[PDB]
């Protein structure tokens, strides 16, 4: 439980950098733009997670459908085992049933 | 986001401060102190 004996260098975080000042600027593009672009067309990240939400099972299934043919051999096998385990756990195990 | 307990030093000090006058290994080891402190109260 030994704790550090020297005060760490305090992080001087500037609340007014480019990222924080312009954070969430075009969140109302659809409302104030004649409904030409839905706000879900601004999400940056995975191909299969742009404007989508789900639990762990539905996420792994969705990933295999879209980018399954582009994954590596080892990554593809590990995804299959994760799908099978979640399928068995969600349906054949639990308390409320 | 890996969350770890950092104030664990004060977690055991709140227990050992009531067990400073015991005899044997109950005044140093935490596991033996809690059973002695709980019975003390």
């Amino acid at each position: 439980f030994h704790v550090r004996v020297t005060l760490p260098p305090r992080k001087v975080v500037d609340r007014w950098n480019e990222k924080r000042a312009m954070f969430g600027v075009y969140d109302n593009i659809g409302i104030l733009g004649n409904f030409e672009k839905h706000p879900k067309e601004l999400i940056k990240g995975p191909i299969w997670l742009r404007g989508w939400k789900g639990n762990e099972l539905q996420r792994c299934i969705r990933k295999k459908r879209m980018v399954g043919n582009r994954m590596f051999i080892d990554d593809l096998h590990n995804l299959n085992k994760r799908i099978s385990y979640l399928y068995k756990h969600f349906n054949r195990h639990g308390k409320y049933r | 986001l890996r969350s770890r307990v950092t104030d664990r030093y004060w977690r055991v000090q709140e227990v050992l401060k009531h067990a400073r006058h015991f005899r044997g290994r109950k005044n140093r080891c935490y596991r033996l102190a809690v059973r002695a402190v709980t019975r003390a109260f």
Binding site: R4, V5, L7, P8, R10 | T6, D7, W10
Partner: peptide, 26 residues
């Protein structure tokens, strides 16, 4: 190295207590 500052600073309160006990001030 655990992230955080409360743990680091709260111990500085303890280090001062030990120094006073070892070398009491006039």
């Amino acid at each position: 190295a655990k992230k955080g500052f409360r743990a680091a600073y709260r111990f500085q309160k303890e280090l001062e207590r030990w120094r006073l006990l070892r070398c009491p001030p006039p």
